[PDB]
Amino acid sequence: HHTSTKAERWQARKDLIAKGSNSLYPDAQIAAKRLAANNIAVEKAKLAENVYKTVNPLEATPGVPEGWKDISNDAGALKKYGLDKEVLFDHADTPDFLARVYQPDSAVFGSDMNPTIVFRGSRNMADWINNGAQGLGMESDYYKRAVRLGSRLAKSVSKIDIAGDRHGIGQAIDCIEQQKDEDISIIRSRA
Amino acid sequence: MDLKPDNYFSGQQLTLARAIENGEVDEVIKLASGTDLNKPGKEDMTLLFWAVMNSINNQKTPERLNVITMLIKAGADPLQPRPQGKNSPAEFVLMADNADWIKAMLNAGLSPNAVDKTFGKPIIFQTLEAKNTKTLQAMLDKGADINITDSLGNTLLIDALDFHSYDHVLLLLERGADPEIKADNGWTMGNQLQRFLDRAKVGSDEYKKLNEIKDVLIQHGGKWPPTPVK
């Protein structure tokens, strides 16, 4: 479906955006503004989708969007942001709170993107843990580890963005891509 | 609901699991010396997690708590991890709202400065997610280093404030935790406390609690206002 590399397509999309921003036509100018914002937003929504594919948080997550690297299991890379693997997910049961951290490839994105941490949405004999958690008075609060990460990221010297159900994310990506196609048409119409 | 040991164990592990289920301390002591204590059964169940599960609600009795102690004394590993980064029985019971279960493990001589086997983090950090400070109190009372750090130089005091675990913050300050420790990023707890204080809404419950923390920090000799981060 795609003939060129991700890097080539990223540059060609910015080239088209620049053509719209230089147009005398107001519709091409506003189309270029929205296209630039949606180009960025669709990359974040693709990462937000990717965290729903994580199974074992200590293993790779399949299908990381092109041009991004998952550093969630790289202690040295995480240290740069004051993070470690342990703080990225809950540990009493199947994770309810789960975050993944991704670094953009500068060969693809230049300086357009930042490292991004993405929070996943919150979600009989095998349910013995949940029984144990209830009798032990466990708080079981998604917000605790999320707030803790927010507090930590405010101290990061290196820039890092925050992003992030699975069906709703997919539909969101559809709506963004639809908007992109419409703005590309408007821009091409004014050449 | 009501668990059945046969869903997780067979053979000699099942015979021990039934003694645990029945809360029979002497039978547990007798059998534990000849049983593989650490090989998991089904659904990630281990004999030590089974003992925890048989000591809750109406089964939280002195004898059933002591079964946990006696299994650890016999060789059951309270720091054994579960798969996929899931935590050990010691870390799990540090999250509880009551310290009876961690005390049963400390009574078998588990070090209060122990670290977990997957991430290498001191298990005392898991107390910060508990709904009160009872498990942290039990760890400190047994002699844990109140100023212990994680791999990034964070103390319990620093991490508890970031967690918004404000009653843990207060307890740590009152027990003499050093508030001047800087993490690897050069921040103290107080540096974050100042950020939090400055953005809090006057008279909100968050404002009231953060100011209480500031007052207690000062009352215990901490430097205020904090030295800005370098």
Residue numbers in the entry:
A (entry chain B): 168 to 290, 299 to 339, 446 to 472
B (entry chain A): 1 to 230
Give sentences copied directly from the paper behind this entry.
Here, we show that AGE crosslinking is harnessed to activate an antibacterial phospholipase effector protein deployed by the type VI secretion system of Enterobacter cloacae. Endogenous methylglyoxal reacts with a specific arginine-lysine pair to tether the N- and C-terminal α-helices of the phospholipase domain. Substitutions at these positions abrogate both crosslinking and toxic phospholipase activity, but in vitro enzyme function can be restored with an engineered disulfide that covalently links the N- and C-termini. Thus, AGE crosslinking serves as a bona fide post-translation modification to stabilize phospholipase structure.
The crystal structure also reveals an unusual interaction between the positively charged sidechains of lipase residues Arg180 from helix α1 and Lys461 in helix α13. Fo-Fc difference maps show continuous electron density between these sidechains, suggesting that the residues are covalently linked. The +36 Da mass shift observed in the modified lipase domain is consistent with a methylglyoxal-derived imidazolium crosslink (MODIC), and MODIC fits well into the electron density bridging Arg180 and Lys461. MODIC density is also apparent in the crystal structure of chymotrypsin digested lipase•∆ss-Tli complex. In the latter structure, chymotrypsin has removed the entire catalytic core of the lipase domain (His340 - Leu445), yet helix α13 remains tethered to α1 via MODIC. Thus, AGE crosslinking joins the N- and C-termini of the lipase domain into a topological circle. This intramolecular crosslink explains increased gel mobility because the lipase cannot be denatured into a fully extended polypeptide and therefore adopts a more compact hydrodynamic radius during electrophoresis.
